[PDB]
């Protein structure tokens, strides 16, 4: 279905002598593929997925030069923000950016994104029209007028409609057999007395990729909506993920409950039950 | 390829 590219950028100022740390991470279909970190010994963009090994040295050199430019842009911007909010000079402050594009199967731009946050709060964003800005507070109004005056939206619109789209296309072609890879979940149910005559049934899914997955519990053909605990999907650390969902049930009825596991890599959704 | 910002904040 859809495809996406994003670059997530962070600059964090530090009270000491050090310049802010600037980190940029690129994503294609939610998978990290490049990263730049100013704290590294030799700061440069690096590949973070195998299929990016296809790009030549000019790609990395010029993207690195771009990051260096961004790094200065974020430094200037952070100093401006200190002034806008009349903040004191001995603190730490975070500026973030999210940019990118969503595509259709036919390679049309569905939606472009260019937005910023300061101190974890939305600051300013380019509207879906790619021409106007939504500013969240008084400081952002200053930025908004500067950018309206200098016609900044036209430059971002050009990037989002052109380069973002065109490079995402190229990356998807290069990462075809690599992006399609899946690991199916392996699932099982565990049984945990906790009783006022009750037990927790916990349905586990392990070793799966990508992270997207749905776990359901049911009783006698009905989905169980409430009283069901669902942990955030978590990385195993080896490139696979884990998740569980649990329900509290009456002692003696455990066999009546079934868990279902839906995942892309599967041929069919898994269905399972506590097996004593 | 990554975006490049124009006028600063």
């Amino acid at each position, epitope marked *: 279905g859809p495809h996406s590219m994003r670059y997530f950028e962070t600059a964090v100022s530090r009270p000491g002598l050090e310049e802010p740390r600037y980190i940029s991470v690129g994503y294609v279909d939610n998978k990290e593929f490049v990263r730049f970190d100013s704290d590294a010994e030799n700061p440069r963009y690096e590949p973070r997925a195998p299929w990016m090994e296809q790009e030549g040295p000019e790609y990395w050199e*010029r993207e690195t030069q771009k990051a260096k430019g961004q790094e200065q842009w974020f430094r200037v911007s952070l100093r401006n923000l200190l002034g806008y909010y009349n903040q004191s000079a001995g603190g730490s402050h975070t500026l973030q950016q999210m940019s990118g594009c969503d595509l259709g199967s036919d390679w049309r731009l569905l939606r472009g994104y260019l937005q910023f946050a300061y101190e974890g709060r939305d600051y300013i964003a380019l509207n879906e029209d790619l021409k106007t800005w939504t500013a969240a507070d008084m400081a952002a109004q200053i930025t908004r007028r500067k950018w309206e005056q200098s016609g900044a939206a036209e*430059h971002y619109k050009a990037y989002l409609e052109g380069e973002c789209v065109e490079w995402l296309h190229r990356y998807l072609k290069n990462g075809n057999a690599t992006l399609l890879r899946t690991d199916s979940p392996k699932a099982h149910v565990t049984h945990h007395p906790r009783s006022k005559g009750e037990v927790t049934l916990r349905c586990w899914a392990l070793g799966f990729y990508p992270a997207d997955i749905t776990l359901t519990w049911q009783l006698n053909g009905e989905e169980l909506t409430q009283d069901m605990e669902l942990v955030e999907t978590r990385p195993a650390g080896d490139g696979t993920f884990q998740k569980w969902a649990s329900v509290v049930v009456p002692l003696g009825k455990e066999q009546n409950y079934t868990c279902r596991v839906y995942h892309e890599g599967l041929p069919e959704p898994l269905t399972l039950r506590w097996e004593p | 390829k990554a975006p*490049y910002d*124009y006028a600063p904040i």
Partner: T-cell receptor
Amino acid sequence: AVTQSPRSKVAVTGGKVTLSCHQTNNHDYMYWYRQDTGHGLRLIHYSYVADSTEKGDIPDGYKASRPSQENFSLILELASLSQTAVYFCASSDAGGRNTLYFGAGTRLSVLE
Amino acid sequence: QQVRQSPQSLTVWEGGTTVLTCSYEDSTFNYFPWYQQFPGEGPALLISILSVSDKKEDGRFTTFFNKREKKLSLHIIDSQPGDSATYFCAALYGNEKITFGAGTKLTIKP
């Protein structure tokens, strides 16, 4: 505004020369360019922050100094005949695509 | 040198249309500002255009961009004396530093 000082300078070969630039634009980037018989804008040095500088395309024979956000100077320690030229300072908001705003030029003649 | 600008000097008759052209080597260059420099002054941004556009018109000045030829041009219609100046084409990719051509000095003589 971007204002350069002096407007014109005559110097002896092997003499020290300092060309000054003052910008009131609150811009962080500053540049020194060289123009020859009315042609070219060749970057000598630039600076994106109030105490360091970076080499441009033709830095040899010149040093640069950024003592302040408003001030960027070009230094010729031992002026040579080859440095007879017109020098232009510029400022920009954040480099890259941001418009460069230029001073009016300083003509330097180096004589024996 | 990445931006090639010829000729060194050009004269065209008052009222005529000047065509100034430049070529570039780097096919990735995507922003193209022209700067105008009057005698005794510094350059100032005249007009600019992005790679996504074919032309940008402003009054009597029009920039054209030709991706396939890797050519820029500036057209001045009804060329008048006050337009005589040095015109610099320029080019960059992304946020990289600007590269200037050598400049063409234009004479509008009546």
